[model samples]
Target: KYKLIMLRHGEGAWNKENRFCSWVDQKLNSEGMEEARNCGKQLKALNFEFDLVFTSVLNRSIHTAWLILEELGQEWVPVESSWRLNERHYGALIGLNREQMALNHGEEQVRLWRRSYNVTPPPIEESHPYYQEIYNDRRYKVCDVPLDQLPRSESLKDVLERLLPYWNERIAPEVLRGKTILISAHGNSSRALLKHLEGISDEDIINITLPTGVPILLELDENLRAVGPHQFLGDQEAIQAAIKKVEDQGKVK
Candidate 1:
């Protein structure tokens, strides 16, 4: 039996304010911590344990994953971190409040940038505090891949391209080998994988959304096709509402 679990990091500090939080590296807020604990408690109730863990270089994900693992009694598990698991770089929109930005630019335009499969927003410049400065963050330095070419802006399409290679080279092998893999990543990071695994069309991906901190379980056989529909580990209705909230981000409050 092969089981793979995927989840977005719980509500990053920016999520509470409904801001664009691509690569700013904020940690989980209090709500996020509770979400992680609840996720872990749910999984623990179901007796789920992961043999391998993967997460992003961002502390938000690192912190969220640890909370989940702690609740699941898996604090001793080995972990791997990669920049490839980072959120889709939201370009110049990274730190701005979503509702405020929509007031500045029309909500319709903002929604297009956020939901469109391939369109990218304005790129962040080298002089931009985080663009040049985040490189100095010691955690990002641990990525081990080419950091010089890191993104200042990305489309979901761009995210999928960059993410798939790592998934192919690193994650797929582990999945095929029968290891239980738990990937705690960002929204678009997991979405990119879902596109690959579920054969979702680029146009259809606009409708696909993920809730922060909800663990989605995908059971696969040797060939890696789904054994059944993907499942949310906890309350289904609450998860649906959360996903609706994620999709509602760019809309005016």
Candidate 2:
């Protein structure tokens, strides 16, 4: 028997505008910080403790982890940040408003771009406005993989492909050893993981959306099969509202 807690980081500045912040080191907004603190409190109430924490290199995720750990009074818990846990690269869609995109591209197309499992958005090019800044970021410079291996854009399948190695090599081993762990990551990364762990069908995976800052407690058997459906750790109504917020991002508002 083992337990794992997974969370999508609290909202980033771009999240407020319904813009894709994938692979961007967007900082958490004030409300996001509050959400992270709230998550920590929720975990505390559940009498949860963590042996280790995992996060993406992005500050949004990292800061959320810090906020949660602080609230739990577990500052001493070890956290490992990795590029593999980073958000799915949004390609050319990065920094563009989702509603605006819905207006420019048809809402149906935008929906596919945003939620489809295998469809990848257009890749970011060197001439693109944000490319230099994102590509030149020093944080990614130290990645174990070569620079060229970094994604320009990625489908959800690509995310699973990239994330599985890290999961197997670093994370899975610890889970097998019965260490309680917390993973604070991005939306797509979280979804990719759920798809893998739950053996969700490719067609069904597109409809799943994870709410920001909500902790999902997963119970697993000795073989790591999920014991039941993912269990969210807070008010069901509020969590539904949050999930609705993410689902409505592609609307032409």
Candidate 3:
């Protein structure tokens, strides 16, 4: 069986603040760094070895990937970075508190913007505070696609579309080649991958939530199809609580 390990980056400062991180380059906070280290330690204890690591261009993802590699004592593993693996561009919702948005827009609307497959949050306007910073970001300039092709906003469907080409061109080939792989990315990117690998429907995809810094293991047959449901490698009860906490983040009091 072929092996693939995928995980979202450790919690970010924005995550702790309960804001949308989207494409903004927030670095992992101290707790997040510790989470990454723990992830690596768990993988190490389980005898997991990776031949290659993939990450988004965003520093949080890259940093998490590096920390895990360090813990596994495999810092020399080759790493590839791509904008396609970024968190879904949260658009105008970037940096906004989730509960506050739920209050402003009504809980269901905010939930739809976040969890639905086709509902995109409003696009960022020129007057938005972070517009200059997001647009001027240097890392996006070297993207596989032209800079203009980068997203201003994305629904889950949009993320899936942009992410699939890279999966087909780069990742799937490596999987079929028998390389054990690790993908350190954001929630939406990981969701997109899961939707593809498991053939999850648009309606059902909304229910999927990934906790920060947990490694998920998937067993694949030679054809690159996942053999069973993905498994998270960690303490079961804590992981369940983590998932529940993620689910509650979008609800208003």
Candidate 4:
């Protein structure tokens, strides 16, 4: 069977701050780094080796992957970073604290902005500071394919559109070749990939949320199809609790 492991990067600074961070390049906080190191240790204990490692272009995801590979002593393996694996773009809501957003926009509206499958939050105007500075940075020049190509904001549907191409063209091919694969990415982006793999419906996809610093295992048949289903590593109760926390984010408050 071909094995695939998907991991969400460790908790980030914004996560600790309860802020919405989309397309921002924040690094992992100290605690987050420690969590990543621990995640690496756990994987190392299992003596897992991956043929290829993939991460989003964001520093948190890249750093988490690096730490995990280092723990497994597979630091020498090639690592691929792609913007297509980046987190869902939050657009105008990016960087806003959850409490503040709820206070300003009302919880129901914020919930729709965050969780509605086809409803994207308002786009950031080009005049916004983030667009003029950070978004236009040269470091991303190669990855920023085009303005129209970039997402101002994204629904889960939007994320799947970008993510699946990478899966089909890059990752799935290697899996077909029977290579073990490891993917480190964000919550919604991972869900987008999972939705495609599991054949989940649009309405149901919005309710799925992946927690930080957890490993999700998928067992595949010889033909690279899922033999059964994806399973989360760690205590089942804890995992369910973490997922519930994510689900509660947009609840009536």
lDDT of 3 at 219: 86
Q: How accurate is candidate 2 locally (lDDT)?
A: 0.89
lDDT of 1 by residue, 51-166 (tens): 87888888888888899899988988888888888889988877788888788898877776776678887898777666755767776665655566677799988888888888
Task: Score candidate 1 by lDDT.
Answer: 0.81
Question: What TM-score number comes out for model 2?
Answer: 0.97
Q: What are the runs in model 3 whose C-alpha is more than 4 Å off?
A: none
RMSD of each: 1.8, 1.1, 1.1, 2.0
User: Which stretches in model 1 have alpha-carbon errors above 4 Å?
Assistant: 227-229
Off by over 4 Å in 2: none
Better-scoring candidate (TM-score), 1 or 3: 3
Better of 3 and 4 by lDDT: 3
**Superior by lDDT: candidate 1 or candidate 2:** 2
Worst 10 residues of 4 by lDDT: 131-140
Q: Highest lDDT, which number?
A: 2
What would you estimate as the lDDT of candidate 4? Answer: 0.81
Q: TM-score of each candidate?
A: 0.92, 0.97, 0.97, 0.91
Q: Model 3: per-residue lDDT, tens digit, 107-149? A: 7898788888999889887788788887787887777777777
Error of 2 at 155 (Å): 0.3
lDDT values for all models: 0.81, 0.89, 0.88, 0.81
